[PDB]
Write a protein that binds this ligand. Structure first.
Ligand SMILES: CC(C)(COP(=O)(O)OP(=O)(O)OC[C@H]1O[C@@H](n2cnc3c(N)ncnc32)[C@H](O)[C@@H]1OP(=O)(O)O)[C@@H](O)C(=O)NCCC(=O)NCCS
Length: 184
């Protein structure tokens, strides 16, 4: 009983067991995982899918599996997740995305994110959605600003689930509120 969302090309849907093989391939891909501490093995990939499924069970939304009707069953994920960790901007709702590299450069993450944020603001009627990444991940924060999300560099933060001296600790924060989304 999970709400599926449609864009012109994409179906944002609940995860299926058949997704785990294709998602594990992505999580083992160094180009997909470049701006994360490590690639994941199958056990770690499956544990991430388990957390996504638990988010859907608890909240009725989550990082949707991305299907491309007419083309491919599974190309990655894009969607909303609740931020509960000890950061200055919590509690709030965030948006995240991970696409198989064959699908980059097609505006498919843009379309998935527009579909997810329409749901956030029209259906859930949330006041704001945030997103966060590392400065080197230019494809990721580039998508954030193209969506109309905006960054205050003063809100840069150290990720509280990484070591205080972790080389990838430094994150940047983007925000979009309901009014800014509507004004696009
Ligand atoms: C982050 C990520 C989802 C971005 O995907 P993306 O395909 O670059 O993003 P978009 O969907 O906005 O597509 C933009 C590109 O498509 C092009 N494009 C083509 N048709 C388009 C259309 N109809 N609409 C928009 N852009 C279009 C743009 O020109 C741009 O190309 P460019 O990068 O050469 O300038 C992807 O790179 C990824 O999965 N990265 C690895 C995982 C990751 O780091 N996730 C984020 C962690 S914080």
């Amino acid at each position: 009983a999970i709400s599926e969302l449609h864009g012109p090309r994409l179906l944002l849907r609940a995860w299926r067991d058949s997704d785990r093989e294709a998602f594990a391939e992505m999580c083992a891909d160094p180009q997909v995982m470049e701006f994360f501490p490590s690639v994941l093995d199958r056990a770690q990939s499956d544990a991430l899918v388990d957390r996504v499924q638990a988010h859907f069970a608890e909240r009725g939304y989550g990082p949707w599996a991305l299907e491309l009707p007419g083309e491919a069953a599974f190309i990655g994920f894009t969607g909303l997740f609740d931020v509960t960790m000890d950061v200055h901007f919590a509690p709030t709702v965030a948006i995240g995305w991970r696409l198989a590299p064959a699908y980059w450069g097609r505006g498919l993450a843009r379309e998935a994110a527009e579909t997810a944020l329409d749901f956030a603001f029209e259906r859930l009627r949330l006041p704001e959605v945030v997103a966060f990444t590392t400065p080197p991940n230019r494809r990721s924060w580039g998508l954030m600003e193209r969506l109309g999300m905006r960054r205050d560099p003063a809100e840069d933060f150290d990720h509280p689930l990484l070591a205080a001296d972790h080389p990838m600790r430094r994150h940047i924060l983007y925000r979009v509120d309901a009014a800014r989304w509507a004004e696009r």
